[PDB]
Amino acid sequence: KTVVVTTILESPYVMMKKNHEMLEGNERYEGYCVDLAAEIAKHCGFKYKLTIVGDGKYGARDADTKIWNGMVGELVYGKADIAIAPLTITLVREEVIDFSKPFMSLGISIMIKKGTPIESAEDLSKQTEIAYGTLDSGSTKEFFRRSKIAVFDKMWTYMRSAEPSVFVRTTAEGVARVRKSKGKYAYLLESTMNEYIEQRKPCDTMKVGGNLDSKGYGIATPKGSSLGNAVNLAVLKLSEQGLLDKLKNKWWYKGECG
Amino acid sequence: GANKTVVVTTILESPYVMMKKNHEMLEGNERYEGYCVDLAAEIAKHCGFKYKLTIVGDGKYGARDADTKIWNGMVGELVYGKADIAIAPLTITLVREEVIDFSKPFMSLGISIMIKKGTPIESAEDLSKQTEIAYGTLDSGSTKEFFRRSKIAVFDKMWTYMRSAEPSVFVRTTAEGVARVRKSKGKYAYLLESTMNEYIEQRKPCDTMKVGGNLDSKGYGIATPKGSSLGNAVNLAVLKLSEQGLLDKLKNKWWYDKGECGS
Numbered sequence: 001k002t003v004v005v006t007t008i009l010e011s012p013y014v015m016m017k018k019n020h021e022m023l024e025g026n027e028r029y030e031g032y033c034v035d036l037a038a039e040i041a042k043h044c045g046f047k048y049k050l051t052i053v054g055d056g057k058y059g060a061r062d063a064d065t066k067i068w069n070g071m072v073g074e075l076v077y078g079k080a081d082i083a084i085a086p087l088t089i090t091l092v093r094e095e096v097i098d099f100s101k102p103f104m105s106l107g108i109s110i111m112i113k114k115g116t117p118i119e120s121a122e123d124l125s126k127q128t129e130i131a132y133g134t135l136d137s138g139s140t141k142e143f144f145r146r147s148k149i150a151v152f153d154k155m156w157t158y159m160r161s162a163e164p165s166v167f168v169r170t171t172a173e174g175v176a177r178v179r180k181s182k183g184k185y186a187y188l189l190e191s192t193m194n195e196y197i198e199q200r201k202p203c204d205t206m207k208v209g210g211n212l213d214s215k216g217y218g219i220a221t222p223k224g225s226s227l228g229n230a231v232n233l234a235v236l237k238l239s240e241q242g243l244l245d246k247l248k249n250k251w252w253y254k255g256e257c258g
Numbered sequence: 259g260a261n262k263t264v265v266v267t268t269i270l271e272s273p274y275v276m277m278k279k280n281h282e283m284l285e286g287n288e289r290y291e292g293y294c295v296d297l298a299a300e301i302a303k304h305c306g307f308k309y310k311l312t313i314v315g316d317g318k319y320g321a322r323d324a325d326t327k328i329w330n331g332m333v334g335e336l337v338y339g340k341a342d343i344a345i346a347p348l349t350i351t352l353v354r355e356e357v358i359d360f361s362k363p364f365m366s367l368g369i370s371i372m373i374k375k376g377t378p379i380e381s382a383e384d385l386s387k388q389t390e391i392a393y394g395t396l397d398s399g400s401t402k403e404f405f406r407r408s409k410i411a412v413f414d415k416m417w418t419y420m421r422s423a424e425p426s427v428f429v430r431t432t433a434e435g436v437a438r439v440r441k442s443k444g445k446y447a448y449l450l451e452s453t454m455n456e457y458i459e460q461r462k463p464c465d466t467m468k469v470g471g472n473l474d475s476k477g478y479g480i481a482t483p484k485g486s487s488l489g490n491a492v493n494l495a496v497l498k499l500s501e502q503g504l505l506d507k508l509k510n511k512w513w514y515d516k517g518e519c520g521s
């Protein structure tokens with residue numbers, strides 16, 4: 001029957017269409033992952049229903065209860081059959097769910113308000129005037145918590161105890177804070193989202209330095225799901241036909257910034 | 259059920275796998291050095307197995323003969339049960355994914371253009387709109403298949419030309435392509451992966467360079483025979499090494515740390 005797809009409202013991957021309130025079903029959404037889902041579904045020959053993840057989180061495991069939340073949790077507990085969104089492939093997640101080869105590449109990066117005197121992660125670590133944080137329940141936060149790299153280790157030690165909290169519930173709130181903090185707050189987010197933001201009004205944000213790591217997003221399915229194989233082959237076909245590149249160019253590259 | 263030495267197939271391709279100086283008096287795995295030599299050691303340590311490095315017999319990556327339907331190169335070694343795992347710059351592709359297993363990528367790359375410094379060429383577009391400068395790719399690899407299969411105008415145009423060019427514009431090894439670029443006084447441009455291109459750009463006599471953006475985006479993956487029990491473990495090993503930052507360290511080690519062109 002119908003494949004239940006869990007995804008998340010994150011621009012430009014999944015966004016509510018203008019006048020969505022009178023729309024219904026899958027027609028309510030638009031974005032990179034909306035088009036991707038349609039392409040995958042066609043190649044694998046299945047019907048699907050897009051659903052926004054209940055708690056609006058990507059996926060993290062509670063150290064105490066050891067329960068998974070976000071989209072990872074919905075796959076693990078059988079609430080969804082597949083996840084098509086900017087879900088990062090990580091070791092801890094790979095041990096509980098299946099992932100296709102990556103359909104998009106990215107790396108943790110730094111977002112600053114134009115003019116901020118910061119050029120790297122190291123610069124941030126050696127000062128305290130400018131505050132910096134990350135998104136909660138995501139791979140970026142986990143990256144800093146787990147790093148044994150001096151600089152990142154130092155940055156984590158600071159972030160985890162900073163008051164007020166430097167962590168945000170959503171990417172949009174992280175961006176908002178950078179823009180509204182007169183340069184006293186830098187945000188650590190993935191390059192894909194960073195580059196999308198610096199492309200639009202009011203064109204006051206900027207990505208500085210190189211990415212801290214190199215990785216990618218993958219389409220996830222419950223461990224052992226029979227859907228996995230077909231989806232992986234589909235991702236590779238779309239990659240080779242150059243369709244994944246076309247979708248990126250479509251949803252990312254305006255002119256209201258210069 | 260007893261553990262036995264894992265047979266690793268790989269290819270002599272710098273800086274992934276190279277003959278160590280004094281190799282003529284060394285034996286086994288000690289005869290080699292390189293990015294994939296270090297990677298194989300890391301993977302083995304993490305997966306807890308012993309291994310034997312074996313240079314692929316025909317010196318090819320892997321392609322299937324349209325008529326006999328037989329696979330050659332490293333892919334053939336895995337498919338026909340000659341090797342237990344492949345650790346080398348083997349590109350993850352659809353046709354290969356259909357016959358063998360691949361871990362998540364351990365290195366990213368894209369098809370690129372290598373030119374002799376000074377050559378008046380900035381893109382694949384430039385190459386397709388002229389005939390003074392010849393150009394080609396490596397045989398039996400993903401790059402040649404890319405042009406053969408492209409439905410994109412400019413790439414289709416390049417393939418129509420390359421496939422019929424005389425003398426042949428294709429080479430059997432990367433080394434042969436590099437020498438052709440270096441000796442053709444700017445009359446030959448070579449299409450190869452960004453990884454190999456960037457490595458050579460750091461090698462003496464520093465007379466070549468990468469131009470334009472990459473034509474595509476993909477990566478190399480560690481391969482195993484389809485259904486092999488070794489696959490799960492090595493994939494997790496690749497992700498761990500990735501997150502510990504080791505992979506980035508190895509890239510810098512063999513590519514830039516000791517480049518011979520300064521900077």
Ligand SMILES: CN1CCN(S(=O)(=O)c2ccc3c(c2)S(=O)(=O)N[C@@H](C2CCCC2)C3)CC1
Pocket residue numbers: 101102103104105106215216217236239244245248350351363366475476477
């Ligand atoms: C310069 N940019 C590089 C990244 N690409 S991209 O749209 O993010 C893209 C497109 C296709 C693929 C990737 C990224 S990827 O993350 O490197 N994964 C590849 C696959 C294809 C072979 C197995 C890895 C497909 C856009 C252009």
Ligand SMILES: CN1CCN(S(=O)(=O)c2ccc3c(c2)S(=O)(=O)N[C@@H](C2CCCC2)C3)CC1
Pocket residue numbers: 089090102105214215216362363364365366367477478497500505506509
């Ligand atoms: C700026 N360079 C980018 C490429 N890296 S790299 O050494 O080739 C490298 C290192 C680790 C990984 C890659 C590439 S990758 O091809 O994008 N694959 C990633 C994995 C990690 C999550 C699943 C994809 C690991 C070196 C630095």
Ligand SMILES: N[C@@H](CCC(=O)O)C(=O)O
Pocket residue numbers: 058059086087088089135137138139140141188189190
């Ligand atoms: N893509 C991340 C969320 C964003 C972030 O952590 O920066 C994840 O899958 O957890």
Ligand SMILES: N[C@@H](CCC(=O)O)C(=O)O
Pocket residue numbers: 319320347348349396398399400401402449450451
């Ligand atoms: N990495 C390629 C070989 C090099 C090339 O085709 O340019 C392959 O696995 O086929």
